[PDB]
């Protein structure tokens, strides 16, 4: 196939100006969408704080308005999803991947509103869920919308604009441009066959998305963890030990979410009213735990700098890990709109910090700072649960800027992804697309 390739190499990277320009506008809208979605989620969380003050004396009434405020916002989000867009439940990264396989539709006229407003409800009530899901799905659909509006033709544009949407979408959720592009290249593209996704364009989308986010967010970083210490070579083996711990825990956590989806589906059977009533009990629990023990609730970005700084006791870190594993399953397996990405960072950070603490006390000749082990384990559940280790690495790299930790991060990740493979685990986003594509056939 020599002379074909001779002509193919010659015709390499010449993305049609039409697709390049359309990725430019797609990134800009996904930018504004994620910016607005972010300001929105914050505003309800603030109102919710100011309500607990108008009632800061009658401690039971305090616990009540904390429950009901999140119950109401939760239910609203469940309903908006069951009634008008069922595939905007849960994360939504499984659907955008399916859409790249051409096995699920991009129903943009329905999802943009359902996800955006549905998420504002579940995130804004302080449920343990991430902005990733919402912005990723929302962003891909925004790409289809401009595909349809401008009626561009071809697989290139349909797969590209669908991709450049979800990349710029994950970028704007973490001020994380490189992580976004890498998310498509390692995790979201069609995994078993070639694709025409023009990377130069996904790139133009991520730039514009990131510039919009910088216009509304500069001077404040999502995670400021300072510059930590370096890692001596004779310490690396301790990070691989950490990865092995994640590698067996990774799939163990994947199993629970699948079965917990089942155990919660038994709760409502499929009945839109039992379901929405359940999410008000979940959301109300979260807005309640968010008052009485905030570390067990919320997205989890807040407790990351605190855990890295060694500011928790070892007991507290154990408590938090259990509790946050509990409230993470309750929220994500219920199907409420919102990603799982962000809260898995916290579960990872918390675990590493606990590991770094024990590592500090066993090896004073090593001169450890528990903080480096948090930064390594932060992207670790991403590796052992969703099996996109290269994406978690550049993600944590972008958010904490401790590049001198590049080796223990890479090493703990490969450790988690290898032991997750060898203990019979599956990439979480791909094992969700399955049971979805399998029920979307088992009905026949």
């Amino acid at each position, epitope marked *: 196939r020599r002379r074909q390739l001779i002509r193919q190499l010659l015709e390499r990277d010449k993305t049609p100006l039409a697709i390049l320009f359309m990725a430019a506008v797609v990134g800009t809208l996904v930018g504004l969408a994620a910016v607005a979605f972010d300001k929105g989620v914050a505003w309800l969380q603030n109102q919710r704080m100011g309500a607990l003050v108008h009632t800061a004396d009658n401690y039971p009434l305090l616990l009540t308005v904390a429950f009901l405020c999140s119950a109401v916002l939760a239910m609203f989000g469940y309903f908006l999803v069951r009634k008008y867009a069922p595939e905007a439940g849960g994360s939504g990264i499984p659907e955008i991947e399916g859409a790249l396989e051409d096995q699920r539709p991009v129903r943009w006229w329905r999802v943009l509103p359902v996800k955006f407003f549905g998420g504002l409800g579940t995130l804004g009530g302080g449920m343990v869920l991430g902005r990733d899901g919402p912005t990723v799905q929302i962003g891909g659909n925004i790409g289809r919308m401009v595909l349809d509006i401008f009626r561009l033709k071809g697989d290139e544009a349909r797969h590209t604009l669908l991709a450049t949407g979800a990349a710029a979408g994950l970028a704007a959720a973490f001020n994380a441009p490189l992580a976004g592009i890498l998310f498509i290249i390692e995790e979201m593209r069609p995994q078993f066959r070639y694709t025409l996704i023009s990377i130069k364009a996904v790139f133009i989308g991520v730039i514009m998305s990131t510039i919009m986010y910088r216009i509304f967010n500069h001077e404040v970083a999502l995670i400021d963890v300072g510059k930590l210490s370096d890692a001596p*070579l004779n310490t690396l083996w301790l990070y691989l030990i950490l990865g092995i711990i994640f590698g067996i825990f990774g799939p163990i956590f994947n199993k629970w979410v699948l079965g917990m989806q089942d155990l919660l589906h038994r709760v409502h059977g499929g009945n839109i009213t039992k379901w929405v009533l359940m999410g008000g009990a979940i959301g109300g629990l979260c807005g309640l735990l968010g008052f009485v023990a905030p570390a067990t609730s919320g997205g989890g970005f807040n407790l990351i700098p605190i855990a890295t700084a060694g500011n928790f006791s070892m007991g507290m870190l154990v408590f938090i890990f259990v509790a946050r594993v509990i409230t993470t399953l309750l929220c994500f397996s219920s199907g409420a709109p919102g990603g799982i990405f962000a809260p898995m960072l916290a579960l990872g950070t918390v675990l590493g910090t606990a590991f770094g603490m024990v590592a500090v006390e066993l090896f004073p*000749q*090593y001169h450890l700072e528990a903080g480096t082990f948090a930064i390594a384990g932060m992207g670790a559940l991403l590796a052992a649960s969703i099996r996109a280790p290269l994406t978690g690495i550049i993600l944590v790299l972008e958010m904490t800027d401790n590049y001198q930790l590049i080796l223990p991060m890479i090493i703990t990740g490969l450790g988690a992804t290898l032991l997750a493979q060898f203990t019979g685990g599956k990439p979480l986003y791909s094992a969700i697309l399955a049971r979805t594509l399998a029920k979307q056939e088992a009905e026949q």
Partner: antibody
Amino acid sequence: EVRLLESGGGLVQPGGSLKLSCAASGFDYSRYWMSWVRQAPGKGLKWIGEINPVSSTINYTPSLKDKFIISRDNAKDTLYLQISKVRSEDTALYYCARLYYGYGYWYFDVWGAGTTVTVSS
Amino acid sequence: DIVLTQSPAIMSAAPGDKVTMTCSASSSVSYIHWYQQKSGTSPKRWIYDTSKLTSGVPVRFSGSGSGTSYSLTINTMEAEDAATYYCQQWSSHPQTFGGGTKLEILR
């Protein structure tokens, strides 16, 4: 240059107390651990303790409770050692030192001139 | 903790000449460090990680060994090489120095 200059050493009565000071000049005094090592007259080098830049973990040799108090002032670029209940065993030349590493087995990177603590009545 | 006992407690040797001292440890030790103290001056870090020179240290110096026995050596000695050579470990905690080995010119 990189200079470690320590003062505070003198004559002290037994059971009294002294606070040696180590003054840093030529490098970022944070990001470095510091350490005190004393050398009894005509004897070997002895390790007192060490202290990490954030003052968050201080280690001392197997020696008593409040005997030694290592502390540091990153604003002032200065390292402190307080010896309490001074015996004649504490008569020695006290060295201030900055720590580093290579393969991760740590060493005593750059030392200072020293100060002398005499304990007699 | 880990006792280090340097061997030729005092010793002399003529200039341009091979010298060899020894560090010797009760338990096992990895990568030892060697400092040179001259009468009246701060100790100097001379050799680290079993084998590694420092900037300025002349290449007549060398370290070697393993486990529970290391050593410093001068292929051709000089005059400025007269000092005390202290070995020290941190493979284990807490770290420990040896007794010293005084190197004096022979004449």
